[PDB]
Amino acid sequence: MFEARLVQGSILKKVLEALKDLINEACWDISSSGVNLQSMDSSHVSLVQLTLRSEGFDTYRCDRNLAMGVNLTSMSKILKCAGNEDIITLRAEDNADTLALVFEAPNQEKVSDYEMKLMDLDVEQLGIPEQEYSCVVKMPSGEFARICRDLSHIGDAVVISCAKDGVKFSASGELGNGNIKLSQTSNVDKEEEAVTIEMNEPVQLTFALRYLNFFTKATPLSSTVTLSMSADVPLVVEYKIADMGHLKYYLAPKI
Amino acid sequence: MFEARLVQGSILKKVLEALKDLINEACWDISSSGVNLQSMDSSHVSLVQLTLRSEGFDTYRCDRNLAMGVNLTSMSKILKCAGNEDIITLRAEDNADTLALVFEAPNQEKVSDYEMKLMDLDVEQLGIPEQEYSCVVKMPSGEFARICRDLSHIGDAVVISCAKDGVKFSASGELGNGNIKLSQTSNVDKEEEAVTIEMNEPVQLTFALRYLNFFTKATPLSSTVTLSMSADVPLVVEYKIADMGHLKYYLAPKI
Amino acid sequence: MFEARLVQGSILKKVLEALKDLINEACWDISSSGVNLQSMDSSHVSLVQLTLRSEGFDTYRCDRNLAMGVNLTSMSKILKCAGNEDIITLRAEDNADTLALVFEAPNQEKVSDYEMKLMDLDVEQLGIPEQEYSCVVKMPSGEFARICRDLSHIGDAVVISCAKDGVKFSASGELGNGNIKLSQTSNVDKEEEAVTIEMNEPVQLTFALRYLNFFTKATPLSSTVTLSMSADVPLVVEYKIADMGHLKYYLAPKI
Numbered sequence: 001m002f003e004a005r006l007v008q009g010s011i012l013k014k015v016l017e018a019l020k021d022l023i024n025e026a027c028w029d030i031s032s033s034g035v036n037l038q039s040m041d042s043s044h045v046s047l048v049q050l051t052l053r054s055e056g057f058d059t060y061r062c063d064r065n066l067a068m069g070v071n072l073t074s075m076s077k078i079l080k081c082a083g084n085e086d087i088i089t090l091r092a093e094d095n096a097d098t099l100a101l102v103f104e105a106p107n108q109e110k111v112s113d114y115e116m117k118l119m120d121l122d123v124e125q126l127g128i129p130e131q132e133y134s135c136v137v138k139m140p141s142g143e144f145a146r147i148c149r150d151l152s153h154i155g156d157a158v159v160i161s162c163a164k165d166g167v168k169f170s171a172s173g174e175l176g177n178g179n180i181k182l183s184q185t186s187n188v189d190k191e192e193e194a195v196t197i198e199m200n201e202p203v204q205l206t207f208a209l210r211y212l213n214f215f216t217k218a219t220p221l222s223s224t225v226t227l228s229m230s231a232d233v234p235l236v237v238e239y240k241i242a243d244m245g246h247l248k249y250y251l252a253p254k255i
Numbered sequence: 256m257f258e259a260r261l262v263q264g265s266i267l268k269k270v271l272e273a274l275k276d277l278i279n280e281a282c283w284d285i286s287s288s289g290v291n292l293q294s295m296d297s298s299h300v301s302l303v304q305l306t307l308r309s310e311g312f313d314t315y316r317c318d319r320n321l322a323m324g325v326n327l328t329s330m331s332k333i334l335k336c337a338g339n340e341d342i343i344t345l346r347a348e349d350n351a352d353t354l355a356l357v358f359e360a361p362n363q364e365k366v367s368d369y370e371m372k373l374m375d376l377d378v379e380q381l382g383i384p385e386q387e388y389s390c391v392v393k394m395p396s397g398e399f400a401r402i403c404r405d406l407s408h409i410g411d412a413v414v415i416s417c418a419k420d421g422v423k424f425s426a427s428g429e430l431g432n433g434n435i436k437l438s439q440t441s442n443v444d445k446e447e448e449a450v451t452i453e454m455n456e457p458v459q460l461t462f463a464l465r466y467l468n469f470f471t472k473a474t475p476l477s478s479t480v481t482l483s484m485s486a487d488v489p490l491v492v493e494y495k496i497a498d499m500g501h502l503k504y505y506l507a508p509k510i
Numbered sequence: 511m512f513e514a515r516l517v518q519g520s521i522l523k524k525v526l527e528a529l530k531d532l533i534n535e536a537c538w539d540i541s542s543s544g545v546n547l548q549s550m551d552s553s554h555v556s557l558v559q560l561t562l563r564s565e566g567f568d569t570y571r572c573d574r575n576l577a578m579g580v581n582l583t584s585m586s587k588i589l590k591c592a593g594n595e596d597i598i599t600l601r602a603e604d605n606a607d608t609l610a611l612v613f614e615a616p617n618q619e620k621v622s623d624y625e626m627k628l629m630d631l632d633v634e635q636l637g638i639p640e641q642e643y644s645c646v647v648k649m650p651s652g653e654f655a656r657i658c659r660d661l662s663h664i665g666d667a668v669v670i671s672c673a674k675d676g677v678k679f680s681a682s683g684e685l686g687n688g689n690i691k692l693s694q695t696s697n698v699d700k701e702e703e704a705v706t707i708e709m710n711e712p713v714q715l716t717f718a719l720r721y722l723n724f725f726t727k728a729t730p731l732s733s734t735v736t737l738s739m740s741a742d743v744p745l746v747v748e749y750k751i752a753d754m755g756h757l758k759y760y761l762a763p764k765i
Contacts, residue, residue: 071430074430074431077408077430078408078430078431078433080405080408081405081408081433098431107440107442107444107447108438108440108442109437109438109439109440109449109450110398110435110437111435111436111438112405112433112434112435112436113433113434113435113436114409114431114432114433114434115431115432115433116430116431117430117431143620150590150591150622153587153588153590153591154624175581175584175587175588175626175627176584176588176608176624176625176626176627177624177625178588178591178622178623178624178625179622179623179624180620180621180622180623181621181622181623182619182620183618183619183621184619185617185618185619187617187618189617192617194619195619326685329685329686332663332685333663333685333686333688335660335663336660336663336688353686362695362697362699362702363693363695363697364692364693364694364695364704364705365653365690365692366690366691366693367660367688367689367690367691368688368689368690368691369664369686369687369688369689370686370687370688371685371686372685372686
């Protein structure tokens with residue numbers, strides 16, 4: 001059987017709120033290594049890459065390999081019933097037609113046992129190889145969420161330019177245009193981070209803000225976010241689920 | 256004349272927010288004992304039983320008996336104008352065509368004097384006799400509100416089963432089904448209560464979650480809620496207005 | 511060129527949220543004295559009078575006179591992108607077709623540079639002379655906002671009566687009527703203010719609550735609000751932008 005016990009049930013709730021707005025039909029690849037998820041949106045522009053290691057689960061147990069076709073919108077409704085401190089436990093059988101969901105209160109008074117039906121998926125699997133990117137921008141997750149939200153009111157697409165000085169976001173629309181230059185000033189404070197970059201070569205691409213707004217739904221999961229981009233390759237937005245795995249977001253450039 | 260002065264005006268605001276979603280046409284039975292209200296919904300499945308003792312009012316004064324046909328939705332709009340710490344004073348005459356509503360600020364700077372027109376009611380009165388119930392479940396008011404809200408996403412009806420071990424809530428719908436078993440674990444903490452029960456005999460009935468969601472609108476009124484149920488009799492949900500009275504909610508079983 | 515630097519960028523955000531609901535087509539009169547704005551609504555019942563002194567700007571610089579026809583709704587969308595502590599800098603040229611908007615983070619890491627297109631206005635200018643009013647009521651800004659909001663549920667118009675004792679607000683509508691008498695009780699507390707008045711002669715006029723609700727959008731700007739009114743003259747609602755200027759709101763009496 002499959003049995004994964006997560007003490008921090010808040011993590012799984014934050015994960016599912018990050019996918020349901022982008023995708024609603026995906027497959028959960030379950031193995032001894034951990035949980036994996038790979039799916040695209042309707043228009044096949046973006047891709048999700050979820051990984052949850054078994055080393056992070058309080059109690060992991062998987063006999064054979066599993067591939068669970070799960071409706072995310074349905075699952076998100078169920079995981080809305082779980083509390084923040086509630087210990088969430090997923091439990092499938094090896095011939096699983098359904099998937100159980102155990103929401104356990106800390107003191108074990110309120111024990112909830114949900115049961116979600118699976119479905120058959122005609123899935124097309126995507127194998128993305130490892131690439132070395134020209135630029136890797138590290139920034140606060142709340143910072144990137146505001147930038148994408150503010151430029152959404154300006155235009156439909158964002159021009160991201162990168163150099164050695166810093167990264168500049170640009171948008172143009174109806175009421176005009178705006179520019180957000182992210183630099184690395186030298187001040188004196190505490191842990192407020194900035195925006196370190198590992199530029200090998202300057203890049204300048206354009207991306208859709210609609211899908212970037214879907215990516216910022218994984219904000220609560222991580223304190224900071226890395227955006228790795230390179231000429232003629234899709235941009236990767238990564239939210240690292242600390243001590244569990246990571247949530248990558250691939251996105252193709254425009255035109 | 257009728258004159259009732261309530262120092263804690265927040266209570267009356269919490270009371271009216273609990274009825275307006277269930278009923279909008281009810282009669283206020285006023286006497287020397289206190290305030291009483293008894294009315295059913297449109298479909299005559301549920302009943303409200305409000306009681307406010309005169310022993311709890313800062314200043315109660317009733318010459319003769321009164322029966323005031325009051326539009327609750329209209330009254331709820333007016334009582335939305337009262338502050339939280341505002342001393343609310345209700346004042347009718349003995350031949351009342353209208354009902355006055357005095358909202359007094361603590362320091363007596365902001366004094367508001369509202370006037371609401373009454374209406375004639377073709378009311379059908381209901382006399383419910385006292386019954387001894389098979390099971391009385393005591394639980395936090397915020398706990399019962401979450402259970403009813405979470406199962407609402409599952410199905411339309413909830414199967415409540417009771418025993419000696421504990422109480423189990425069940426629902427089944429489109430995306431699947433869920434079960435919430437409330438037990439009495441033995442841990443070590445403080446005043447976090449659990450769910451004591453006085454079962455004489457195990458009961459199992461089914462109720463509508465739509466009307467139960469109307470009942471949980473009386474949450475702010477009480478810290479805990481009692482649900483007394485018995486085979487072939489309507490379930491009673493009671494929110495005790497401390498040092499004032501109680502707000503009962505009768506509900507007929509399904510099928 | 512025109513260059514105004516405001517350290518407290520929150521003020522400008524609060525200003526624009528107060529106009530956009532009342533008016534959306536106005537002209538910004540820029541001179542060495544400071545910023546001025548004078549415009550009416552569609553139905554020409556109310557008038558806005560914004561004044562921001564150059565003595566309050568961290569860095570003011572205006573070569574020649576300027577009159578900028580600015581879409582307020584467009585500008586409000588842009589100023590929604592500015593942070594609370596962000597240092598906002600407005601910068602036009604002397605032949606300005608557009609208007610720049612510099613949003614500078616304190617530590618100067620996040621620097622945003624927006625650009626808004628101006629437009630030609632067929633504006634009708636209004637010269638209001640200084641008048642001595644019969645009554646000037648001083649009250650908390652949050653107090654006046656609640657009074658206008660509560661009477662909005664009652665009726666469409668508010669009857670404001672003034673005397674030596676205090677000021678009384680009255681409204682009548684469908685579910686009935688209400689009265690709010692503001693007096694000056696003698697208690698013992700701290701800085702909770704009340705409602706001082708400089709009545710020369712008692713006044714009683716009627717005004718629309720729809721436009722008064724548009725005026726209360728300038729609440730965050732000031733702690734207290736002054737309402738100066740006089741028989742047969744329009745009522746003036748003033749929100750004083752401390753150490754910067756003031757935001758007046760003229761409103762014609764009904765009938």
